Amino acid sequence: MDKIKQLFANNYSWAQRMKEENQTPHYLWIGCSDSRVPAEKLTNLEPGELFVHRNVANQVIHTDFNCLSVVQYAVDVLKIEHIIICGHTNCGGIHAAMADKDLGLINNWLLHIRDIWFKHGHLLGKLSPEKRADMLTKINVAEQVYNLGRTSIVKSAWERGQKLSLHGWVFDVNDGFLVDQGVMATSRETLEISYRNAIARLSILDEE
Template identity: 35%
Template sequence: MSFPNQLLLQNVAWAHEAGRRDPALFDRLRQGQQPKVLWIGCADSRVPAEIVTGARPGDIFVHRNIANLFLPHDDNTMSVLEYALYVLRVSDVVVCGHNGCGGVRAALEPPGHNMPRVEHRIGVLRQLARRHGAELAAIACLENRADRLAELNVIEQARTLETLPLVRNALPRVCVHAWIFDVRNGLIRDLARAIDPSVDTGATGTSTADVTTMPLSQVSWPDAHGGAAGQHVDQRSAAGR
């Protein structure tokens, strides 16, 4: 049996089981969608948004592409954002990257000549790697260097989102989150919350809710060694590259 045919059979089994567990599920889905979150993630087959978060159908509005990039000049991406904010009225936008990302690693290697569209797509990642060249050069292992660039990329895309009038003017107010998924253990790390472990204990006088709703441009992100990496925001992102 071919794998596509196997998927069709699995779909039948899933539909029966989902209907058995939640008899009202398909009635709700038929009435429309009311997702709470827009998820901008990587197209990598190992990071399916609904599965890794335990979400139900209708909970997450998903946009995925190579290396979870958000490019303001890309009509595909911008139309997803526009629809999510002004029609679906989501209140949260998650940018989720992951370690072991092939697109991110490619940005640290010599250009490939047989995939011009991919190469064009990851050009912004090469620029980001050059901007953080000193920090990345200090990481000897290529795998670890790529994982650090994946984190920097998530932060960059989240900051880019926050600069957009589309996001700033949206009602209800939109919170942008920067997450990284670890394919080695299946856990998601909130990069904003990971900056200061004392946040959850209240030792700093700031609640977790305060941090996770704080504009990302106000967050001092950690570098690869745990120190503050500064608050640089590439203003070119607001106008497109």
């Protein structure tokens, strides 16, 4: 089929063109499989400085062997000092989590997002229906940071004095800016005050 022939052609000419014209990783990036812009473009860094895992809806699920293997290898073997969870606006995973459809094996993966919805129902309830998905994309990032900070791998690193920070941002495609959701942890105590403040701030609604 033509699409495969086109990759071979696109590849051959790209390599030829790069030649005509003319590394330790420092971050573990946990992003979404349906994110559109690659992390190296968005952050403008050189090849090799990101070690990358991508899964549906940028989740850190307590018992995933694939993501947890990557986090252990990055922290214990490669000695990386910053883990970043990046969500994004118009996320297909989040919309699929709020819809009522049965999609098969993938719905099982998305049930973790539905539990987060009910945790903040009284707030989201006194919000007009059409604004809820944007608030939930924000709250999901805050809860995944809270999850990463509770793993045995991260808590044990903090306990033995290893320097490690956790960050939770949203990539806003409408202006290309990364927006800080306010949960930033360098320890167990900072994880709690920071998580609690962020939710209280997120809970004062526009009177409209």
